[PDB]
């Protein structure tokens, strides 16, 4: 989920250790979901759009 900084925020200019960004939160969530599954893992995405029958792509994490 893409949440852009306000653009005048000073924290995004000089990042530090404990800085939290929504991009790194969802990227680490995909790792939490990978280790959490003890038996089966289900990952589904739309490869082809049903409307115009074009090509789509999965997330870079997948």
């Amino acid at each position: 989920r893409q949440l852009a900084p306000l653009g005048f925020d000073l924290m995004s200019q000089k990042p530090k250790r404990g800085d939290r960004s929504r991009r790194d939160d969802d990227r680490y969530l995909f790792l939490e979901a990978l280790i959490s599954a003890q038996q089966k893992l289900y990952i589904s995405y739309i490869g082809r759009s049903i409307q115009d029958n074009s090509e789509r792509f999965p997330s870079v994490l997948v």
């Binding site: 653009g7 005048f8 074009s54 090509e55 789509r56 997330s59």
Partner: protein, 98 residues
């Protein structure tokens, strides 16, 4: 170019949204193929072969493509209407917009 750049610093503008998602995956696949070609030092394709000939240090270049591969999620490929929306919301005060 005078200096190497980061994926997030490269701006690509394509008027169709469907072409921006295809070009994003097309670049994502070409960064992955060139990265493997840098580690293998050999490739079966003419374009990637001429690229490996110009590459000085293949080890550092493979690390740059790896960092370029992980950032392809925030890689910027936008339409004209999708650009201004992100740009005017970046700096609000110069544009004078909510």
């Amino acid at each position: 170019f005078p200096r190497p750049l980061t994926v997030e610093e490269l701006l690509v503008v394509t008027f169709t949204e469907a072409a921006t998602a295809e070009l994003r995956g097309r670049i994502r696949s070409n960064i992955h193929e060139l990265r493997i070609a840098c580690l293998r030092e050999t490739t079966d394709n003419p374009l990637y072969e001429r690229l490996l000939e110009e590459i000085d240090d293949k080890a550092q270049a493979a690390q740059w493509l790896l960092l370029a591969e992980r950032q392809m999620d925030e890689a910027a490929v936008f339409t004209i209407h999708g650009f201004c929306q992100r740009m005017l919301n970046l700096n609000a005060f110069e544009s004078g917009m909510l």
